[PDB]
Design a protein around this ligand. Sequence first.
Ligand SMILES: Cc1cc2nc3c(=O)[nH]c(=O)nc-3n(C[C@H](O)[C@H](O)[C@H](O)COP(=O)(O)O)c2cc1C
Length: 344
Amino acid sequence: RLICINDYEQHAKSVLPKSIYDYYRSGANDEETLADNIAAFSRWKLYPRMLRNVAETDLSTSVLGQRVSMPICVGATAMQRMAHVDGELATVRACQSLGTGMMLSSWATSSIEEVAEAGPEALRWLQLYIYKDREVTKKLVRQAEKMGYKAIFVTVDTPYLGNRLDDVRNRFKLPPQLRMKNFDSGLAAYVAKAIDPSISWEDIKWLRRLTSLPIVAKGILRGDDAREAVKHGLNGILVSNHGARQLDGVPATIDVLPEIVEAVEGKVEVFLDGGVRKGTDVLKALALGAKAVFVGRPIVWGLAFQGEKGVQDVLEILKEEFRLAMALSGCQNVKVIDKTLVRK
Ligand SMILES: Cc1cc2nc3c(=O)[nH]c(=O)nc-3n(C[C@H](O)[C@H](O)[C@H](O)COP(=O)(O)O)c2cc1C
């Protein structure tokens, strides 16, 4: 049956209700960036070295000082229990099995505590939105800290929700037996009521004083903004267009990655998400300077197939495709994945 990430998406389309599949699949508006996040990877070509000795390929690396088994981590995707009953709990258990990290959504269908208890040994980080209610915001950060989450990924590209046309057509909302457990399109209205469109760099200063955990700015697309995040004492940049779900017509993340890596001058780690489906995608992102990449939708499709096992399978497919891509390119470990491997 399912031997690559595209197969898991096709299976998911066959077994999820239309409104749930569409919520997970959609991009904003005409979905130009959604297509480009995938097409852009294909424009970057690989220049493999031969005869390097790849008997022993080591995929391990570090994210903000914490070891991971591979440079492929789970990105925040809201409300995972729509795809499968165990939702976030499963994801975290799969991450623990694989030895990689899970970024937990602020809009999870499982609590910060339920997920930590399910994956105590897993590397876990919290994705944060700055809520209008700063007491809501602080108690999410404090709960992450106490529960041995290792970083905060603050999403900075969502003052308002993007306009995902299928959610508006389907009048998206949660199934009746589910909730966000940490507290037109139903979700766009929720954002308008709950999430602060006023936040500025002053709020980043606030958050940077609030916690000693590492903080990564998620959703940066400009070098100037990245340099501002470094000036504010943040510890990494996640180059992201929110899975193409926010402003349509922004570039693909793999295309803006080199500007961001150049702008930060090695001062903080730079990560990528958006369109990662294949081991060669991971290799290209690392060659252009990313420390690791995050996967969003493939994880949801792993849930839709077979829950915890299905997330494990998706992660193992990515790991094996990445291993093969490294070996065929002449790379024994991630430290030798250099810029000459790629050209656009
Ligand atoms: C269904 C879905 C729900 C998402 N929920 C969140 C969220 O709660 N918080 C967040 O910061 N980003 C959210 N994102 C954006 C993802 O973190 C990530 O940037 C994006 O999925 C990466 O692209 P990919 O799906 O192509 O891998 C979501 C994306 C999707 C598809």
